[PDB]
DNA sequence: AAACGGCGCCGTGGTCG
DNA sequence: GACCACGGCGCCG
């Protein structure tokens, strides 16, 4: 239609050989301005003719550009506009179908669609001053940060993981043999069907749980938990489950994903994938790397700094409860955080009517259960189960909780009232989620929706704050010669030359804690290490002084 | 805490061959 | 035999 190159401000369209930009061949590149499409004769060379990537999935093209040594930032992307209007807008195909046009497999058509959808979606954002603020001050600049994170990747200790694989392989084989013995015949332990036979037919154990959909007897951790003490075969299966889980999902796959050009591992940070405004991570998911068990901790050790560099790990402490304090205005919850006290200890002190010094471990763990339970509307029935106490004693506990934090109850009631009346809920900054079924006739469907309504404002506000912090911090890091590697919702992992790592840590803390004024301080824990686990361990050791 | 809701491995039954 | 969609199960915050 028109020869390459396009005029200024053109929208890009592109086709990759695969979805993962760090691995993909750029097959086709095109640009549209005024409905006129320019197709590139040779895509890679044609990248140099763009000042920025403006278009659907602009970040993905920016990542591939960075891989080829080219500093092409992402700009406007209609996906971000659509996501802000309605976070159920998660794919170009779905956005096209809903808002107009069609997502095809041809670069030129993708360029024209990008240009048209941008104008369509921009139009619908007129007068939406808070969404526009989020677009301009958070999402659009974040896309550039995410591009540098994905293209940088993270260094992995492959030999450590090769070794760890062997070690765990041995333990798996042991457990398998010990289980087969107790079964009196071999089978596939990985098969939940075979296992459901063995456990509940052959060995005749009690099955108290059902699967979610198939209506079968569950072999889940929850279903089997109460059979654990009395039945060692169960104990061995759960051990086998954990090891095979971590080996098959993490220990074995990750070494094979090291990139030949970078020597590093590259994830994707999906910016329009969640209903709450959180990022997600995929290919692989580096926001689900094990950490909680002994073996999980050992996997975290595999994530290492470049030679001469250190990882910096930063963590917003109790970000959900601090957000709740701000959103609710509950003066008692605000006071806790203002005074630097331990929310779970303080809750327990009032719950059990003891001075904070007399709070014992059982009391704190109950208060902690209650504290997080309030984020899902404070169910009395679910409280009775987790603490293993009469339903009526659960109700009493809840009443006692709301006596000390009455504006949290107020916030709960208000969130649901507005949700019911307006049809959506929102974060502090005005990110919006439409939540149906808040007046559903079926109690289970209704309550499930209520839990979504409470979730999104808290988790979504925390996401908005972390995103804004990333946007603020990233240029500062660039100046100091440091990198931003991972985000795990309330956590950031940076990488800095070892001599500057301490200053990077101090700067990052300050930016994150000062990101935005709330009724309470944001507290950020910070650790420095040669691997991800050491860095997190260091954060705790430092927290004592700090 | 893991309650929501992200993402990924696994085995299974159906389908085409 | 090769391939796929579906759902069990469970990692993380």
3-state secondary structure A375-431: HHCCCHHHHHHHHCCCHHHHHHHHHHHHHHCHHHHHHHHHHHHHHHHHCEEECCCCC
User: Quick one: tokens of A169?
Assistant: 């392989």
Nucleotide nearest to A88 (CA to C1'): B5
Answer CATH for A320-460 from 3.40.50.150, 3.40.190.10, 1.10.150.20, 1.10.540.10: 1.10.150.20
Distance of C1' in B6 from CA in A87, Å = 14
**Closest alpha carbon to A347 in A328, A329, A372:** A372
Instruction: State the first-to-last Cα distance of chain A, in angstroms, to the nearest integer.
Output: 63
HSE-up (13 A, CA, CB side) for residue A70: 18
Q: What stretch of H or E contains A96?
A: helix A92-99
Nucleotide nearest to A490 (CA to C1'): C13
Nucleotide nearest to A372 (CA to C1'): B1
**How far is Cα A495 from Cα A314, in angstroms, rounded to an integer?**
11
Residues A78 and A271: beta-carbon distance below 8 Å: no
Nucleotide nearest to A288 (CA to C1'): C12
User: Quick one: tokens of A282?
Assistant: 């995929």
**How far is Cα A83 from Cα A78, in angstroms, rounded to an integer?**
8
Backbone conformation region of residue A504, classed left if phi is above 0, alpha if psi is from -120 to 50, else beta: alpha
- By DSSP bridging, strand A2-3 and strand A36-39 are parallel
In the block, tokens 């456990």 appear at A199
Distance of C1' in B5 from CA in A407, Å = 27
Residues A424 and A434: beta-carbon distance below 8 Å: yes
Residues A151 and A22: beta-carbon distance below 8 Å: yes
User: Quick one: tokens of A247?
Assistant: 């080996």
Residues A201 and A185: beta-carbon distance below 8 Å: no
Query: Rounded to an integer, what is the distance from CA A410 to the centroid of its chain?
Result: 29
CATH architecture of the domain A268-318+463-543 equals 2-Layer Sandwich (3.30)
CB atoms within 10 A of CB A158: 16
**How far is Cα A168 from Cα A174, in angstroms, rounded to an integer?**
10
Q: Return the nearest residue to B1, CA–C1'.
A: A372
Exposure letters A466-483 (e unless 16+ CB within 10 A, then b): bbbbbbbbbeebeebebb
Spell out residues with C-beta < 7 A from strand B. Answer: A 188, 190-194, 244, 248-249, 253, 270, 273-276, 278, 280-285, 287-288, 320, 365, 368-369, 372-373, 375-376, 379, 382-383, 386, 448, 451-452, 455-456
User: Quick one: tokens of A383?
Assistant: 């409280």
Determination technique for this entry: X-ray
**How far is Cα A219 from Cα A232, in angstroms, rounded to an integer?**
15
**How far is Cα A313 from Cα A298, in angstroms, rounded to an integer?**
17
Distance of C1' in C3 from CA in A469, Å = 45
Exposure letters A379-412 (e unless 16+ CB within 10 A, then b): bbeebbeebeeeeeebeebbeebbeebebbbebb
Residues A524 and A509: beta-carbon distance below 8 Å: yes
**How far is Cα A290 from Cα A271, in angstroms, rounded to an integer?**
23
Fold of A158-256: Taq DNA Polymerase; Chain T, domain 4 (1.20.1060)
Distance of C1' in C12 from CA in A434, Å = 25
Residues A289 and A250: beta-carbon distance below 8 Å: yes
Distance of C1' in C9 from CA in A218, Å = 10
- Three-state DSSP at A30 gives strand
Query: Can you point out the beta strands (E) in A57-125?
Result: none
**How far is Cα A472 from Cα A488, in angstroms, rounded to an integer?**
17
Q: What stretch of H or E contains A109?
A: helix A107-124
CATH superfamily entry for domain A2-152: Ribonuclease H-like superfamily/Ribonuclease H (3.30.420.10)
Alpha helices in A481-529 (DSSP H): 501-513
In this structure, what DSSP letter does residue A88 have?
T
Domain-by-domain residue ranges, chain A? Answer: 2-152, 158-256, 268-318+463-543, 320-460
**How far is Cα A450 from Cα A437, in angstroms, rounded to an integer?**
8
**How far is Cα A267 from Cα A59, in angstroms, rounded to an integer?**
13
Residues A169 and A163: beta-carbon distance below 8 Å: no
**How far is Cα A291 from Cα A211, in angstroms, rounded to an integer?**
27
Nucleotide nearest to A452 (CA to C1'): B4
Residues A221 and A195: beta-carbon distance below 8 Å: no
**How far is Cα A36 from Cα A238, in angstroms, rounded to an integer?**
60
Residues A449 and A434: beta-carbon distance below 8 Å: no
**How far is Cα A196 from Cα A234, in angstroms, rounded to an integer?**
12
CB atoms within 10 A of CB A235: 15
Residues A79 and A56: beta-carbon distance below 8 Å: yes
Phi, psi of A314 (to 5 degrees): -120, 145
């Amino acid at each position: 239609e028109a020869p390459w190159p396009p005029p200024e401000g053109a929208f890009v369209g592109f086709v990759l050989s695969r979805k993962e930009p760090m691995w993909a061949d750029l097959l086709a590149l095109a640009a549209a301005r005024g409905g006129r499409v320019h197709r590139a004769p040779e895509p890679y060379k044609a990248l140099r003719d763009l000042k920025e990537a403006r278009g659907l999935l602009a970040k993905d093209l920016s990542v591939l550009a960075l891989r080829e040594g080219l500093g092409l930032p992402p700009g406007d992307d209609p996906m971000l506009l659509a996501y802000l209007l309605d976070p159920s807008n998660t794919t170009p195909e779905g956005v096209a179908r809903r808002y107009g046009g069609e997502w095809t497999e041809e670069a030129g058509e993708r360029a024209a669609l990008s240009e048209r959808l941008f104008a369509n979606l921009w139009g619908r954002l007129e007068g939406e001053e808070r969404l526009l603020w989020l677009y301009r001050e958070v999402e659009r600049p974040l896309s550039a940060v995410l591009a540098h994170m994905e293209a940088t990747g993270v260094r992995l200790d492959v030999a450590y993981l090769r070794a760890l694989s062997l070690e765990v392989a041995e333990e798996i084989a042991r457990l398998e043999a010990e289980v087969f013995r107790l079964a009196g015949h071999p089978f596939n332990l990985n098969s939940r069907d075979q296992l459901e036979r063995v456990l509940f037919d052959e060995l005749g154990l009690p099955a108290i749980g059902k699967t979610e959909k198939t209506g079968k007897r569950s072999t889940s951790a929850a279903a089997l938990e109460a059979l654990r003490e009395a039945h060692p075969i169960v104990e061995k299966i759960l051990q086998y489950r954990e090891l095979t889980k971590l080996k098959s999902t993490y220990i074995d796959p990750l070494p094979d994903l090291i990139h030949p050009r970078t020597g590093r591992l590259h994830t994707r940070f999906n910016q329009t994938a969640t209903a709450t405004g959180r990022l997600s991570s995929s290919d692989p998911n580096l926001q689900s790397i094990p950490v909680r068990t002994p073996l999980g901790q050992r996997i975290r050790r595999a994530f290492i700094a470049e030679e001469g560099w250190l990882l910096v790990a930063l963590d917003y402490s109790q970000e959900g409860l601090r957000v709740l304090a701000h959103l609710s205005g509950d003066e008692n919850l605000i006071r806790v955080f203002q005074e630097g006290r331990d929310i779970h200890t303080e809750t327990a002190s009032w719950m059990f009517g003891v001075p904070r010094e007399a709070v014992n471990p059982l009391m704190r763990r109950a208060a902690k259960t209650i504290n997080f339970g309030v984020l899902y509307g404070m169910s009395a029935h679910r409280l009775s189960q987790k603490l293993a106490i009469p339903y009526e004693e659960a109700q009493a506990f809840i009443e006692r909780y709301f006596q000390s934090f009455p504006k949290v109850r107020a916030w709960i009631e208000k969130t649901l009232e507005e949700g019911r009346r307006r049809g959506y809920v929102e974060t502090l900054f005005g990110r919006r989620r439409y939540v149906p079924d808040l007046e559903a006739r079926v109690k289970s469907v209704r309550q499930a929706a209520e839990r979504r309504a409470f979730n999104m404002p808290v988790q979504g506000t925390a996401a908005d704050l972390m995103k804004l912090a990333m946007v603020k911090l990233f240029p500062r890091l660039e100046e100091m010669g440091a990198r931003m590697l991972l985000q795990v919702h309330d956590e950031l992992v940076l990488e800095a030359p070892k001599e500057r790592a301490e200053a990077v840590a101090r700067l990052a803390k300050e930016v994150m804690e000062g990101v935005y004024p709330l009724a309470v301080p944001l507290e950020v824990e910070v650790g420095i290490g040669e691997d991800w686990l050491s860095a997190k361990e260091a954060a705790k050791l430092a927290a004592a002084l700090e």
